[PDB]
Amino acid sequence: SQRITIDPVTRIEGHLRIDCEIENGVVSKAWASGTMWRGMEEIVKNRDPRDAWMIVQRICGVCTTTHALSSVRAAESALNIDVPVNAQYIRNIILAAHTTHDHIVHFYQLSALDWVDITSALQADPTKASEMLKGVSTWHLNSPEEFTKVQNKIKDLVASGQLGIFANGYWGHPAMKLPPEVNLIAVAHYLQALECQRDANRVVALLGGKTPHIQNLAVGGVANPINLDGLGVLNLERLMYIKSFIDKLSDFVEQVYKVDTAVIAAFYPEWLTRGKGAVNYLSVPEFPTDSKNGSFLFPGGYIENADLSSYRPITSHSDEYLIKGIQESAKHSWYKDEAPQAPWEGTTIPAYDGWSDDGKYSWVKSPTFYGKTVEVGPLANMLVKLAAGRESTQNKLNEIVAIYQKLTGNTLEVAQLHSTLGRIIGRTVHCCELQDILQNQYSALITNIGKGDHTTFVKPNIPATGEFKGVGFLEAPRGMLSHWMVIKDGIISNYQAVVPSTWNSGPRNFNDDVGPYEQSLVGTPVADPNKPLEVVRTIHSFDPCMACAVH
Amino acid sequence: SQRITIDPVTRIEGHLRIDCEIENGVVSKAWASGTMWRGMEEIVKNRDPRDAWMIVQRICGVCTTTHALSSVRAAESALNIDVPVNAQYIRNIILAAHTTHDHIVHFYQLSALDWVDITSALQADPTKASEMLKGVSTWHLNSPEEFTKVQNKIKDLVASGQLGIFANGYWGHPAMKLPPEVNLIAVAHYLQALECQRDANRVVALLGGKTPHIQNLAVGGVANPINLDGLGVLNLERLMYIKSFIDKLSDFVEQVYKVDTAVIAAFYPEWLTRGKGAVNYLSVPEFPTDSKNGSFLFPGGYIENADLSSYRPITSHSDEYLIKGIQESAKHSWYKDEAPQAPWEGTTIPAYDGWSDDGKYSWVKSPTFYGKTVEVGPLANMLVKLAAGRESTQNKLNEIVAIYQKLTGNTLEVAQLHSTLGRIIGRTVHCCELQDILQNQYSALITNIGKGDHTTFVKPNIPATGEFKGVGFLEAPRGMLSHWMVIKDGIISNYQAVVPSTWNSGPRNFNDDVGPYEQSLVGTPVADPNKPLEVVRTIHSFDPCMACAVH
Amino acid sequence: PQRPPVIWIGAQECTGCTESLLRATHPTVENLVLETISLEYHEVLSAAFGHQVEENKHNALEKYKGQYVLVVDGSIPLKDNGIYCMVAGEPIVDHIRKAAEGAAAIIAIGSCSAWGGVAAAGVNPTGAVSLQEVLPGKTVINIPGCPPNPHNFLATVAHIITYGKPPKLDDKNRPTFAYGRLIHEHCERRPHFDAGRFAKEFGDEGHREGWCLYHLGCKGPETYGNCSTLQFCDVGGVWPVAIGHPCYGCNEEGIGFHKGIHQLANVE
Amino acid sequence: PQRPPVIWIGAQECTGCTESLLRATHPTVENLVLETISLEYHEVLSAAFGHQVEENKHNALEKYKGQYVLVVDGSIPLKDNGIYCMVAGEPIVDHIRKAAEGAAAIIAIGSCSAWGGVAAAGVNPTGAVSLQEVLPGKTVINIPGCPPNPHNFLATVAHIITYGKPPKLDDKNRPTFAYGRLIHEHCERRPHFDAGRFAKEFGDEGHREGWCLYHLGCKGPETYGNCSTLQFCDVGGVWPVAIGHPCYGCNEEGIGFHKGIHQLANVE
Ligand code: SF4
Ligand code: SF4
Ligand code: SF4
Ligand code: SF4
Ligand code: FCO
Ligand code: FCO
Ligand code: F3S
Ligand code: F3S
Ligand SMILES: [Mg+2]
Ligand SMILES: [Mg+2]
Ligand SMILES: [Mg+2]
Ligand SMILES: [Mg+2]
Ligand code: NI
Ligand code: NI
């Protein structure tokens, strides 16, 4: 075979190395390696439980908000605190708006240059490009004039001889299949996406106090002071401002991002037949709407062996079956204790000994669910929603399939979703459905305040003796997140984060089974082993976050 | 024949009444009447000269900034203060960005509904509408999809039965000549204009402290503290923010407003042959760039009997020929003293006695220049610039003419500019040239701060005895503005504002000569005397501001 | 669906209060008039003029009797039987009184209508008075400022629409969310005031360090408002003091347009 | 025209400092990379990966020697000979020291690179240190915060471009325009502090009136920054205290990530 290394993998969060053995131009075996560790679990230990969320939020600034929310949920779990409903509405708006930013940036700024050739875009006829979208999109910024302005920006960049982030891209690679016109469409949308994601983060900032790294949470609720009639607090004027940005997100999401997802699939149909990472999938329900940390707007569940018809629903973040199944191993990771550990009993003892193909090769641990490898993230969350018969999800998928069918003459079957493109589709579906989450929760907040409920925070008490345990679940942009806190004598005695990219990117496990990234790469064609674009295509579809995976 | 009254004239600033005698379907005689007075000249009397600008700025909130700037210039003139050049750059950026907002709003929100029929827009084919603009505009928001979204907004408004500001418009009037497609184009641009003008006022706000009604001026300079390295003051970050809004204005101005001006002219070419208000024109130079209140970027001058070739240039705001020529009469105005008065000796003694066709019929005074009626404003300012041989003005006018030529096969000569449409064209040309003023003055400010000049304010002294006279000239959106301050024993002993709409809207003068509004209307065809749209078309072309005219 | 009707009448106005709406972002003026309200009468924006627009006003006063919000900017001149503001041949005070009869809510937007403002200052040439003075039996909601941040008005209207009543008001009928506190009791330069760090003249060293503007005449200590928090234009960091100029007290009767710029405020 | 080159290397970074750029408006990130600078190396955005992106780095280090701005986010781990951050098989400290050799200016963006930040807190598992600590012979410009407002960085770069030198720095090499003053010495809640008007718990009456957050643990009294003035995201009114939560001191070594949220600050 031939052995390649891709190090660094760019257009991800953090530091990732991918190695592949290639046989006759097909990947036969792969290794995923998180190459940077900070020890965030040890850093947060031995502190007041109330302080954890501000520290562990810094696990990641791409998926900002997520670790903050999971941390407060974990402490509230340990302490048996029911969060006020207004605090849930606010937490939910933040998570949904953040995830809108996150997914948009992933499709465009992180992923599109795997599929889009900017050199080819320079050859495009902008009027032909605009005509291709007639009856496929109603977006107001697909005119030839817009596309010509974008083309000229690329022209000027290339002419300057300073290509910057575009230098040495995979232009003319044999796996680049788009016509010039679709390349130009995609670049115009790449630039337009930056305005939409900015508006999404304006929603986050107005409730969080800033972004990246929100600062409005607390163990017990939120720090936003609700007072419609108060100066300098969360009043009606501020809520109206939030709404003005919520309303700005839908058109781009529905008329650009959703449409481009179908267009990419239409031109890359072989990518519906590779990149399967697992046969088991897990998601947690998300967006609680009652006064007892439940009544989720999105459902969760566990699918085994790709059988949607017999999946197991998960409706509670206190589900004992979910909690008891989660373990992590470090057999092939650079930690000392190798046997599978339940996170409340987890250790994170560094034991770096260099790279070994058959030994330790990553700072990511290997999570399992009742001993099985599991893929998490938007593919998992879409398939669970389909298995639950959620009509909103089926309808949104059907809209993408309808565009794809208009362009190809073909439909998409669920079997084809267990793939690189299916994973991208699940993420787009999630972003689309999150716009309704935002409208729903804004309306819920306005209604509840109008009923006279301005409560936001329940002050915790933390017993100074005893040992007790909590877990906070959250369905993050990249999949199920859980933070596991043990409190002893009033301080954090153990903290373990099991993060979605940990599930997907973790190395071979205690039984040497292969996790999603590594499994997904088997069978990848590599036309040019010096420029393995095809490998990065599949890896990017998981939206790797290695600060998350390793922490 | 018959007598009509138009009261209120809407889509202006302030309170205006227009009366017309119609004979054989044409206006034979007209009266213009300002119907509200506040006495702002009396309110500011007896105060410290330094306080005047904050009070008299409230003459008008449409042309906010202008009276503030003229007032400080008037006190600086009386006191013999040379304004620091950085203060000139800041004052100039404010005036140019304000005027950009002002002109855009005038063409769209105030004037377009004289020429555009929203009912007809409902019949338009959005694709045909977009196709009409190819090779006419490169604007990126002229797609059929944009136009369909706008058409659906109109559709929904009409369907609701609540037309609000659009109710009982002149839909289907025989003087409405645009095809459905051009009506739809104009409404789409009307809405798009609101974003551009908002960006213009973000420039104003960042230097003014807010808008409407800026708060950064002083007799002696400005209150902005220049310190590139200072927290909380006008530093490099704040300047970069200002620049980001300056840069957002050009495309709409050049690709939408400039083009629509030619489009309206192409469909209404008879309006190049009516609406002449005067044969004499006055403008003052504007945007001083030296340390001595001079070196203006825009030239000024006096045109007599439409003779550009023998015009008299005005290069200084201290020009004694300009100063000595200006008087106002109240023979046909509701004030007591009727003989022509130079403003330093002016009075404003109310003497309301009701409406008389041959007596007093307005709160507006009647200004003259060496005994002649004069039109001020964008038509005057364009014609003076053409007389000066200003290439930028020639070139910008030629761009509008070229679009007109492409659309009609006909050209435009200067004689046709003495008209309702020529006046509109002069305003558009001004708005276009002001974008270069903004770039020029932003760059001059950055450059000068980089040479180490951070000075902004010269503290005035005001002698406690003696009588001192000053005049502050400014070329405002609606034309030459002057504030005339007399100081005696340290306080304001006389204050007289002669405002551009005073020149244009003033009633018959001491010699019963007819001012611009009243003259422009003679000969106007009126198809329906109960719905005199044609009269309002010409009056709107002067951009009336009656709070300004009367004060 | 049907939108709540609004009737807007200008008296002795400079138009700056209407113009504030053109800076608004939540809602923008176009969303205000297309989605939030039905603006049944507004002379600055109305397509109709003259007889047609007075037809609109009378139709709306009858169709929406008891339902519309009446908004007035500018002061109302009572001297000499109201002739200092005449629309369609009749004193504006008469137009306003008629419209007030069927109003569900009445708002004085701006200092001129709220308390007389600049038009009533000095010798008061026209006998200008406030909207509340012209409507003694009605509760007038006062939204002062010259002009106020447009959202002080828009969020008041929104509270009426959304929750069915006005926002909470102080004893001058000003919404507490916008006017409940002195500017000086929520001003980011208070630390400099406390330490005696003052600008003495524009352009001096303290001024160029962003110090307190009390000794330049700042009226923050005697002016209620939200200028230091909500600020202006939604760009961040923009209000008079932050730009380098003292508050003039334009919100507050007896301060703005009465005291000189550089006259010192009384401190509580 | 040619644009000034920038090389950006992430060490033990969470990517939040890069993400700050996606909220920026002056310039926006797209105008930054297309008009303001040439971003010659940035792993989050670059089309090239692996051997191709390392080729880009080496080509840029040569073509632009003595000309580029080097930016580092994240701490640099020294424990166990640098192995806690390995890129292309080498410790990140070696990549950074190599790129530092040819730099015209060197910027530590964020608290992690400025002073170790969260990654160096507690027991400091990886021996994480600041950029200045690894480059003792160089003047490292520190732009702390977790993450800073992106324009604290962008205006620093603009000063280097436009006027040819770094902005004025304090004795921690932080730009004075952004870090020259304590938050508490320019905080709009100082009047409440002065009057003893304090929130005691989130959701209490004083909290819901916007009172001072000192007794909730606000670290404004011991943190230098511009959070109360420049604030965040350019929407107006948005920083932690204005939203209702105390400053945590994230800009300031020894405060953020060391003191508990609710631990009280020392007041000068
Ligand atoms: S309050 Fe101020 S802005 Fe409003 S009408 Fe009066 S003078 Fe004009
Ligand atoms: S006097 Fe003015 S600038 Fe100084 S703290 Fe009070 S309100 Fe702020
Ligand atoms: S300073 Fe904060 S946002 Fe920046 S890398 Fe460190 S943890 Fe992340
Ligand atoms: S303690 Fe915090 S909230 Fe209170 S005045 Fe100081 S910085 Fe502001
Ligand atoms: N999304 C996200 Fe980050 C990862 N993986 C977390 O949690
Ligand atoms: N422009 C303007 Fe207003 C008028 N007329 C002034 O000056
Ligand atoms: S002058 Fe007016 S706008 Fe605010 S800052 Fe003072 S009350
Ligand atoms: S926590 Fe950080 S972002 Fe500012 S408000 Fe305090 S220094
Ligand atoms: Mg089963
Ligand atoms: Mg872990
Ligand atoms: Mg001096
Ligand atoms: Mg006058
Ligand atoms: Ni992450
Ligand atoms: Ni005016």
- Domains along chain B with CATH numbers: 1-551 (1.10.645.10)
Distant-in-sequence, close-in-space partners of B172: CB < 8 Å, separation ≥ 6: B117, B119, B120
A369 touches A376 (CB < 8 A) = no
In the block, tokens 């992430």 appear at D10
Query: What number of other Cβ atoms are within 10 A of residue A443's Cβ?
Result: 12
The reply to whether residue B209 touches residue C209, judged by beta carbons under 8 angstroms, is no
Which residue owns the Cα nearest ligand 4 atom 4?
A: D212
Nearest-5° Cα angle at D238, D232 to D240? 95
Say yes or no: CB of residue D225 within 6 Å of ligand 8: yes
The reply to whether residue D167 touches residue B232, judged by beta carbons under 8 angstroms, is no
Ligand 1 nearest atom to the CA of residue C110, by list position:
1
Closest residue on chain A to B136 (Cα): A145
Which residue owns the Cα nearest ligand 8 atom 2?
A: D250
Token pair recorded at residue B2: 């018959």
The whole-angstrom distance between D130's CA and the closest CA on chain B is 25
The answer to whether domain D2-178 has CATH 3.40.50.700 is: yes
CA distance C169 to C176: 5
Give the chains touching D; criterion: ≥3 Cβ pairs < 8 Å.
A, B, C
Catalytic residue among A501, A505, A520, A541: A501
In 3-state terms, what secondary structure has residue C169?
strand
Token pair recorded at residue D87: 């890129």
**B548 has binding-site annotation:** yes
DSSP classification of residue B478: T
Reply yes or no on whether B20 is catalytic: no
Q: Which amino acid is present at B373?
A: T
A211 touches D146 (CB < 8 A) = no
Catalytic residue among A130, A520, A548, A551: A548
At the second CATH level, the architecture of D179-268 is Irregular (4.10)
CA distance B158 to C38: 12
Residue intervals of chain D classified under CATH 3.40.50.700 are 2-178
What technique solved it? X-ray
The whole-angstrom distance between B389's CA and the closest CA on chain C is 36
C-alpha distances in Å from residue D219, one per residue of A164, C193, D183, D237: 40, 21, 8, 19
CA distance B200 to D80: 57
Give residue B304 CA to ligand 12 midpoint distance, Å.
Answer: 24
CA distance C229 to C238: 10
C-alpha distances in Å from residue B130, one per residue of A132, B126, B347: 16, 6, 56
The reply to whether residue C52 touches residue B224, judged by beta carbons under 8 angstroms, is no
Reply yes or no on whether A47 is catalytic: no
Whether A452 and chain C come into contact, CB under 8 Å, resolves to: no
Name the E strands within A394-490.
467-476, 479-488
C-alpha of C137 from chain center: 21
Distant-in-sequence, close-in-space partners of C57: CB < 8 Å, separation ≥ 6: C7, C40, C41, C99
CA distance C114 to B88: 35
B548 touches B59 (CB < 8 A) = yes
Q: Which amino acid is present at A419?
A: S
D239 touches A259 (CB < 8 A) = no
Interface of D with B (CB under 8 A): 25-28, 151-152, 154-155, 158-159, 162-163, 167-168, 175-181, 186, 226, 229-230, 234
Beta bridge mates, A472: A483
Token pair recorded at residue B411: 């050209």
Q: What share of chain C is helix, strand, coil (3-state, %, to 5)?
A: 35, 15, 50
The reply to whether residue A15 touches residue D244, judged by beta carbons under 8 angstroms, is no
The whole-angstrom distance between C164's CA and the closest CA on chain A is 10
**Residue D212: φ, ψ to 5°:** -65, 145
Q: Which residues line ligand 5 (CB under 6 A)?
A: A 60, 63, 66, 476-478, 481, 499-501, 545, 548
The helix (H) or strand (E) run that includes residue C9 is strand C5-10
Nearest-5° Cα angle at A202, A201 to A207? 95
- Chain C and chain D share a number of CB contacts under 8 A equal to 63
The reply to whether residue A205 touches residue D235, judged by beta carbons under 8 angstroms, is yes
Nearest to A184 by CA among A136, A122, A241, A227: A122
Q: What is the resolution of this structure in A?
A: 1.4
Distant-in-sequence, close-in-space partners of A413: CB < 8 Å, separation ≥ 6: none
C-alpha distances in Å from residue C60, one per residue of A61, A72, B246, C7, D89: 54, 54, 41, 8, 77
Residue intervals of chain C classified under CATH 4.10.480.10 are 179-268
Best to test chain D binding among C188, C209, C231 (most D CBs inside 10 Å): C188
**D233 has binding-site annotation:** no
C213 touches C185 (CB < 8 A) = no
The reply to whether residue A145 touches residue B146, judged by beta carbons under 8 angstroms, is no
Catalytic residue among B283, B501, B520, B541: B501
Token pair recorded at residue B406: 């492409």
CA distance A56 to A48: 13
Identify all chain B residues contacting A250, using CB atoms and an 8 Å cutoff.
none
Beta bridge mates, A368: A327
The whole-angstrom distance between B490's CA and the closest CA on chain D is 38
CB-nearest partner of A237 from C151, C168, C181: C151
The reply to whether residue D154 touches residue B446, judged by beta carbons under 8 angstroms, is no
Say yes or no: CB of residue D190 within 6 Å of ligand 4: yes
DSSP β-ladder status, A217-218 and A221-222: antiparallel
